[PDB]
Scaffold this active site. Structure first.
Site, PDB file in Angstrom:
ATOM      1  CB  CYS A   5      -2.418   2.239   2.558  1.00 46.50           C
ATOM      2  SG  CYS A   5      -2.533   0.419   2.468  1.00 46.50           S
TER       3      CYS A   5
ATOM      4  CD1 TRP B 189      -4.815  -8.656  -0.346  1.00 39.88           C
ATOM      5  CD2 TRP B 189      -3.070  -9.467   0.799  1.00 39.88           C
ATOM      6  NE1 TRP B 189      -5.142  -8.633   0.987  1.00 39.88           N
ATOM      7  CE2 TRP B 189      -4.087  -9.124   1.713  1.00 39.88           C
ATOM      8  CE3 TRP B 189      -1.867  -9.999   1.288  1.00 39.88           C
ATOM      9  CZ2 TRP B 189      -3.942  -9.296   3.097  1.00 39.88           C
ATOM     10  CZ3 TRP B 189      -1.721 -10.172   2.663  1.00 39.88           C
ATOM     11  CH2 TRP B 189      -2.758  -9.821   3.549  1.00 39.88           C
TER      12      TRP B 189
HETATM   13  C1  HEM Z   1      -2.039  -6.276   2.245  1.00 32.55           C
HETATM   14  C2  HEM Z   1      -2.757  -5.723   1.232  1.00 32.55           C
HETATM   15  C3  HEM Z   1      -2.824  -4.384   0.847  1.00 32.55           C
HETATM   16  C4  HEM Z   1      -3.916  -3.872   0.232  1.00 32.55           C
HETATM   17  C5  HEM Z   1      -5.249  -4.592  -0.070  1.00 32.55           C
HETATM   18  C6  HEM Z   1      -3.673  -2.473   0.017  1.00 32.55           C
HETATM   19  C7  HEM Z   1      -4.499  -1.682  -0.781  1.00 32.55           C
HETATM   20  C8  HEM Z   1      -4.142  -0.414  -1.227  1.00 32.55           C
HETATM   21  C9  HEM Z   1      -4.915   0.333  -2.193  1.00 32.55           C
HETATM   22  C10 HEM Z   1      -6.234  -0.077  -2.866  1.00 32.55           C
HETATM   23  C11 HEM Z   1      -4.257   1.510  -2.344  1.00 32.55           C
HETATM   24  C12 HEM Z   1      -4.593   2.613  -3.340  1.00 32.55           C
HETATM   25  C13 HEM Z   1      -3.876   2.072  -4.567  1.00 32.55           C
HETATM   26  C14 HEM Z   1      -4.065   2.923  -5.794  1.00 32.55           C
HETATM   27  O1  HEM Z   1      -5.200   3.370  -6.039  1.00 32.55           O
HETATM   28  O2  HEM Z   1      -3.076   3.133  -6.511  1.00 32.55           O
HETATM   29  C15 HEM Z   1      -3.063   1.478  -1.520  1.00 32.55           C
HETATM   30  C16 HEM Z   1      -2.104   2.491  -1.491  1.00 32.55           C
HETATM   31  C17 HEM Z   1      -0.972   2.468  -0.691  1.00 32.55           C
HETATM   32  N1  HEM Z   1      -0.588   1.400   0.087  1.00 32.55           N
HETATM   33 FE1  HEM Z   1      -1.621  -0.261   0.523  1.00 32.55          FE
HETATM   34  N2  HEM Z   1      -2.416  -2.080   0.518  1.00 32.55           N
HETATM   35  C18 HEM Z   1      -1.874  -3.277   1.005  1.00 32.55           C
HETATM   36  C19 HEM Z   1      -0.530  -3.400   1.392  1.00 32.55           C
HETATM   37  C20 HEM Z   1       0.370  -2.365   1.469  1.00 32.55           C
HETATM   38  C21 HEM Z   1       1.715  -2.517   1.944  1.00 32.55           C
HETATM   39  C22 HEM Z   1       2.421  -3.828   2.287  1.00 32.55           C
HETATM   40  C23 HEM Z   1       2.229  -1.263   2.064  1.00 32.55           C
HETATM   41  C24 HEM Z   1       3.517  -0.854   2.595  1.00 32.55           C
HETATM   42  C25 HEM Z   1       4.294  -1.608   3.428  1.00 32.55           C
HETATM   43  C26 HEM Z   1       1.227  -0.384   1.567  1.00 32.55           C
HETATM   44  C27 HEM Z   1       1.458   0.994   1.327  1.00 32.55           C
HETATM   45  C28 HEM Z   1       0.633   1.801   0.588  1.00 32.55           C
HETATM   46  C29 HEM Z   1       0.955   3.146   0.217  1.00 32.55           C
HETATM   47  C30 HEM Z   1       2.199   3.917   0.678  1.00 32.55           C
HETATM   48  C31 HEM Z   1      -0.056   3.573  -0.559  1.00 32.55           C
HETATM   49  C32 HEM Z   1      -0.163   4.882  -1.360  1.00 32.55           C
HETATM   50  C33 HEM Z   1       0.678   4.649  -2.615  1.00 32.55           C
HETATM   51  C34 HEM Z   1       0.670   5.837  -3.558  1.00 32.55           C
HETATM   52  O3  HEM Z   1       0.580   6.986  -3.068  1.00 32.55           O
HETATM   53  O4  HEM Z   1       0.763   5.615  -4.789  1.00 32.55           O
HETATM   54  N3  HEM Z   1       0.068  -1.033   1.204  1.00 32.55           N
HETATM   55  N4  HEM Z   1      -2.987   0.283  -0.808  1.00 32.55           N
HETATM   56  N1  LIG Z   2      -2.836  -3.488  -3.210  1.00 33.68           N
HETATM   57  C1  LIG Z   2      -1.866  -2.580  -3.229  1.00 33.68           C
HETATM   58  C2  LIG Z   2      -0.798  -2.649  -2.301  1.00 33.68           C
HETATM   59  C3  LIG Z   2       0.210  -1.649  -2.346  1.00 33.68           C
HETATM   60  C4  LIG Z   2       0.130  -0.611  -3.313  1.00 33.68           C
HETATM   61  C5  LIG Z   2      -0.971  -0.622  -4.214  1.00 33.68           C
HETATM   62  C6  LIG Z   2      -1.109   0.456  -5.299  1.00 33.68           C
HETATM   63  C7  LIG Z   2      -0.425  -0.019  -6.637  1.00 33.68           C
HETATM   64  C8  LIG Z   2      -1.157  -1.252  -7.219  1.00 33.68           C
HETATM   65  N2  LIG Z   2      -2.280  -0.701  -8.004  1.00 33.68           N
HETATM   66  C9  LIG Z   2      -1.975   0.713  -8.385  1.00 33.68           C
HETATM   67  C10 LIG Z   2      -0.579   1.022  -7.782  1.00 33.68           C
HETATM   68  N3  LIG Z   2      -0.536   2.435  -7.314  1.00 33.68           N
HETATM   69  C11 LIG Z   2      -0.314   3.529  -8.293  1.00 33.68           C
HETATM   70  C12 LIG Z   2      -0.812   4.891  -7.763  1.00 33.68           C
HETATM   71  C13 LIG Z   2      -1.168   5.824  -8.940  1.00 33.68           C
HETATM   72  O1  LIG Z   2      -0.002   6.071  -9.708  1.00 33.68           O
HETATM   73  N4  LIG Z   2      -1.919  -1.594  -4.134  1.00 33.68           N
END
Ligand code: HEM
Ligand SMILES: Nc1cccc(C[C@H]2CNC[C@H]2NCCCO)n1
Ligand code: HEM
Ligand SMILES: Nc1cccc(C[C@H]2CNC[C@H]2NCCCO)n1
Ligand SMILES: C[C@H](O)[C@H](O)[C@H]1CNc2nc(N)[nH]c(=O)c2N1
Ligand SMILES: C[C@H](O)[C@H](O)[C@H]1CNc2nc(N)[nH]c(=O)c2N1
Ligand SMILES: [Zn+2]
Lengths: 407, 411
Positions: free
Chosen positions: B108, B280
Site C-alpha cells: 500500500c 480513495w
Molecule cells: C487513503 C487512500 C489510500 C490510497 C491512495 C491507497 C492506495 C493503494 C494503492 C495504489 C494500492 C495498490 C492497489 C492495486 O494496484 O491494486 C494499495 C494497496 C493496498 N492498500 Fe492502500 N491505499 C489507501 C487506503 C488503504 C486503506 C484504508 C487500507 C486498509 C485499511 C489499505 C490497504 C491496502 C492493502 C492491504 C493493499 C494491498 C491490496 C492487495 O494486495 O490487493 N489501503 N493501496
Molecule cells: N486506493 C486503494 C485503496 C485500497 C485498495 C486499493 C486497491 C483496489 C482498488 N484498485 C485495485 C484494487 N486492488 C486489486 C489488486 C489486484 O487484484 N486501492
C-alpha cells in the site's frame, strides 16, 4: 521445488525447474525480500570448472563422452599444477553467451545466442587494450547497424595483475561540478571525470564530452586513451513535431557498452569484459535524460511545451516524458542507428521467456529491472510473474578499481 | 541485525531494524527471489503466543507495557483461550489492530494515512441482512459526498472455520462483466466469474458496460445472499478530458470508492475473514489498470484512434501518449466533481516522506517495490529510486481463497 510463474494478462502458467540448478545466493531470506536492492583456491576452482564443463559438454550433446572426461581430467591436472586453467575458445564463446543468457536484469536476452565474442586473452598492455576496444566499438557500431559483442581480456591470476576498464561504459559523457554549485554534463560521472583529470585528461568542459578510456593492464596503473572521435557514433536528438526540441542541444551516443562488470566462467574471473548491444529507448529518454540525478531535463522540456506545471496532477512530467522518449526513438531511427522501443523489447522478452521455459526449464528474470521505467503496465512483462535466481556463467558487479588500486 | 536501504536519487541511506520483528515468511529463499509473484482454524497452542505478542505491542504502543492492566489483560486472554479456545479483542485493541494491519501493508502506497482510519465494529452482526446494513453505512460514511474518508468495517472473527463471515465481492463496488457467446466481453472482464455467480444466485443483470454489482454476503457460514447497494449511495464520476471534448463520448465513468472486501484481517492470531476497507483512489488504478490493462476495459486503441496517433508502429509511443491523456482525464474528472483522488506523483512523494518518518520513529517500513511503483511513469516518481525491504508484520491483511471455491453449500 517445481515453481510456477503465471502471466496475469494471459493466464499462461509456466513451470520453472532451472532454478534448482541455481548456485549463488540472492540476498533474500524467508523473512525478508531484498528484490529492490540494487547491490544485495584450487579446492574452490575445480568444482566450478567441473560444473561448467559438464554443462558445456551437455550442450554439445557429448555429456559423459571420452572427450568430456578427457577435458575434465586435463583441466583438473592443470588446476592442481598451475592453480588455474585456460578455457578453450569454444568454452569461452559458450561461456560468454551463457553469461548473457543468464543475466536476470537483461530484457534483450532473446538475442543471447548471436553474441560476437572477441578473444583478447593475448592482450598484455593498456595500448593493446585500447586497440581491441576500438575494434570492438567499430565492429559493434557497424555504421549504425549495431551488433552485439564482448571483448574478453586476460582472466584474473593472483589479483594484483587484473585487467580493468576503469570506465563504467566504453562511451559516456563527462560530468563537472561548476562554481554555481550546479553540475555540468552527466552528474553520474563526476567522480570518474575527476579521476581522468587527475590523470591528465584535458576536459573540454562541455555538456557532452566523450570521456577517455582509463585502461588497466596486468595490474599496472591505468592509462588514458581517447576513442577515435570518428568511431564514437552520436545522435543529435530532435522531435518529429516540436521543431524547438533540437534547440535543447541534446544528443546521445548510439553504443551501449558496459565495461565495469566481471564475467565469471567455470570459476575463472574476467575482470575486463566490455560488452555491448543496442539501446532500448527508455534507457536514454527516461533514465539518462529524465532522472533527477542525471541530465534531468523534464522541467526544460515541459516549459517548451507550455504545460501547466503548477499542479502535479496535470501530469505535465508524464507528458513531457513521453515526448522526450518519442524524440529519442525518432532521432535514432532517422539516423539509421539501431534502437528498440520498450513495447517491442518487452514483447520480445516474453517470447524469449516462453522459449527458455520450454527448451531450458526456466529463465531467471528480475522484474524490478525488466519492467521499463515508464508505461510499466502497458508492456507485457509487467503482468508476467518472474523468478530471480543466479546461474553461472554470469556477469557480476565488482568494486570500482579506483577504490582498490594500489598505485 | 541492521539492514540499510538507499535512495539512488538522493543518496539518503536508511537503516531498518523493524524487520527483526518479522515472523511470517516471504516466499523467497537465499536461492530464489519471489518478489514479483502475486500470491507466493488455529489451536490454543499456537494462539496464545500470537495473542501475547499482539498485546505486548498494543500495551507498548500506549506506554503501559508491564503495567498491571497489561498483565491482567494477558491473564484474562490466557484464561479466555484455554476456556473458549479463542478470545475477544477489546474495542481499543481492535482499532489499534486494524490501523496497524494497514500500517504494515507493504503493497500500500497510501500508508501515510494509516492513523486516520475510521473503524466500524460490526462484531455483533449475525446475518447477511445485518452485513448489508453495516456495509451500506460504511459506503455512505466513506463516500461522504465525495470528501472520502478511509474506513474499515469488521465482522465477527472466524471460530471453527465453518461459520465464516465473508463478503464474496472482491470490492464492495465493482462493475459487472459479461462473456458474450462471440467471445467478446461486455463490462469489466475481471468480474465475469463473479457476475456469473450473482446471476446464478438470482441477480437480474442489466447487462450494460457499467452495472454496479450486487453484494453477495455470507454470514455465520451460511449460504451467501444478494443485496443491491442503494444506487444513491454509489458515487460515480463521468470521465471527461479537459481539452478533448470527444473523451466524454467514450462513455466512460468510474465509482469513487475503492473498497477491498476479500481480504482477511489478522489481529493477535484472530482471523477476521470479512473486513471490508476503503480509502480513495490513486488515479493510475483507474486510468492505467482498470482502463488500459488488455484484460480490463482495454481502451488504449479507441482513445489512440480519436487522438489520431500513428498506430502503425509501436515506436511512435502512441500507447504511451494515449495513456497519459486517459490518466489526465481521470484526475480532471474526479477533481472537477470534488471526489477525492490523488495522482501518482503526489502519492509516491508522500509515501517517501511517510517511509522516512517510519524508519526514524519505527525503525522501518516494509514495502513491496513491485507494487509501490506506479504502473506508468515509474522512474519519474521518487519510489522507483528507493530501495525497499519487504517483510511481513502482524497485524496484517492477507489474501484468502475465494469463497466460492471453499464454501460448503447448505441449500
Ligand atoms: C487513503 C487512500 C489510500 C490510497 C491512495 C491507497 C492506495 C493503494 C494503492 C495504489 C494500492 C495498490 C492497489 C492495486 O494496484 O491494486 C494499495 C494497496 C493496498 N492498500 Fe492502500 N491505499 C489507501 C487506503 C488503504 C486503506 C484504508 C487500507 C486498509 C485499511 C489499505 C490497504 C491496502 C492493502 C492491504 C493493499 C494491498 C491490496 C492487495 O494486495 O490487493 N489501503 N493501496
Ligand atoms: N486506493 C486503494 C485503496 C485500497 C485498495 C486499493 C486497491 C483496489 C482498488 N484498485 C485495485 C484494487 N486492488 C486489486 C489488486 C489486484 O487484484 N486501492
Ligand atoms: C542486443 C541488445 C540488448 C538490449 C536491447 C538490452 C537491453 C537491456 C536493458 C534495457 C537493460 C537494463 C539496463 C539499465 O537499466 O541500466 C539491460 C541490462 C543488462 N544487460 Fe542487456 N541488452 C542487450 C544486450 C546485452 C548484451 C550483448 C549483454 C551481454 C553480453 C547484456 C547484458 C546485460 C546485463 C548483465 C545487464 C544488467 C547490467 C547491470 O546490472 O547494470 N545486454 N540490458
Ligand atoms: N541496451 C543495453 C545493453 C547492455 C547494457 C545496458 C545498460 C547500460 C546502458 N544504459 C544504462 C547502463 N546500465 C547502468 C546500470 C545502472 O548502473 N543497456
Ligand atoms: C531502487 C531500485 O532498485 C532502483 O531504482 C532500480 C529499479 N529498477 C531498475 N531497472 C532498470 N532496468 N535499471 C535500473 O537502473 C533500475 N533501478
Ligand atoms: C506479476 C506481477 O507481480 C503483477 O503484474 C503485479 C506487479 N505490480 C503491481 N502493482 C500494483 N500496485 N498492483 C498490481 O496489481 C500489480 N501487479
Ligand atoms: Zn526476494
Amino acid at each position: 521445488r517445481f515453481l510456477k510463474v503465471k502471466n496475469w494478462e494471459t493466464d499462461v502458467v509456466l513451470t520453472d525447474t532451472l532454478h534448482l540448478k541455481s548456485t549463488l545466493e540472492t540476498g533474500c531470506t524467508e523473512h525478508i525480500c531484498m528484490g529492490s536492492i540494487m547491490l544485495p583456491t584450487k579446492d574452490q576452482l575445480f568444482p566450478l570448472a567441473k560444473e561448467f564443463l559438464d554443462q558445456y559438454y551437455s550442450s554439445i550433446k557429448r555429456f559423459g563422452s571420452k572427450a568430456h572426461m578427457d577435458r575434465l581430467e586435463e583441466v583438473n591436472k592443470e588446476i592442481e599444477s598451475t592453480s588455474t586453467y585456460q578455457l578453450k575458445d569454444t568454452e569461452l564463446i559458450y561461456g560468454a553467451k551463457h553469461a548473457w543468457r543468464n543475466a536476470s536484469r537483461c530484457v534483450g536476452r532473446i538475442q543471447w545466442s548471436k553474441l560476437q565474442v572477441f578473444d583478447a586473452r593475448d592482450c598484455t598492455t593498456a595500448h593493446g587494450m585500447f586497440n581491441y576496444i576500438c575494434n570492438h566499438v567499430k565492429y559493434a557500431t557497424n555504421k549504425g547497424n549495431l551488433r552485439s559483442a564482448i571483448t574478453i581480456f586476460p582472466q584474473r591470476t593472483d589479483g594484483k595483475h587484473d585487467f580493468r576498464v576503469w570506465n563504467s561504459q566504453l562511451i559516456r559523457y563527462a560530468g563537472y561540478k561548476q562554481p554555481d554549485g550546479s553540475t555540468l554534463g552527466d552528474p553520474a560521472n563526476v567522480q570518474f571525470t575527476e579521476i581522468c583529470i587527475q590523470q591528465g585528461w584535458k576536459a573540454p568542459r562541455g555538456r557532452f564530452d566523450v570521456l577517455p578510456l582509463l585502461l588497466q593492464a596486468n595490474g599496472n596503473d591505468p592509462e588514458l586513451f581517447q576513442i577515435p572521435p570518428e568511431l564514437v557514433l552520436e545522435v543529435p536528438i530532435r522531435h518529429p513535431k516540436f521543431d524547438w526540441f533540437k534547440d535543447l542541444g541534446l544528443k546521445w551516443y548510439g553504443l551501449p557498452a558496459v565495461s565495469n562488470m566481471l564475467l565469471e566462467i567455470g570459476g575463472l574471473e574476467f575482470s575486463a569484459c566490455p560488452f555491448s548491444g543496442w539501446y532500448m529507448g527508455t534507457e536514454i529518454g527516461v533514465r539518462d535524460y529524465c532522472d533527477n540525478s542525471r541530465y534531468n531535463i523534464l522541467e526544460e522540456v515541459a516549459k517548451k511545451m507550455d504545460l501547466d506545471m503548477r499542479k502535479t496532477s496535470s501530469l505535465w512530467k508524464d507528458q513531457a516524458l513521453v515526448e522526450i522518449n518519442i524524440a529519442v526513438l525518432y532521432s535514432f531511427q532517422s539516423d539509421k542507428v539501431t534502437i528498440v522501443d520498450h513495447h517491442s523489447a518487452t514483447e520480445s522478452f516474453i517470447k524469449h521467456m516462453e522459449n527458455e521455459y520450454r527448451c531450458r526449464g526456466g529463465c531467471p528474470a528480475d522484474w524490478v529491472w525488466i519492467v521499463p521505467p515508464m508505461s510499466g503496465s502497458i508492456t507485457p512483462v509487467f503482468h508476467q510473474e518472474m523468478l530471480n535466481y543466479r546461474l553461472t556463467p554470469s556477469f557480476e558487479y565488482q568494486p570500482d578499481p579506483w577504490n582498490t588500486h594500489v598505485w
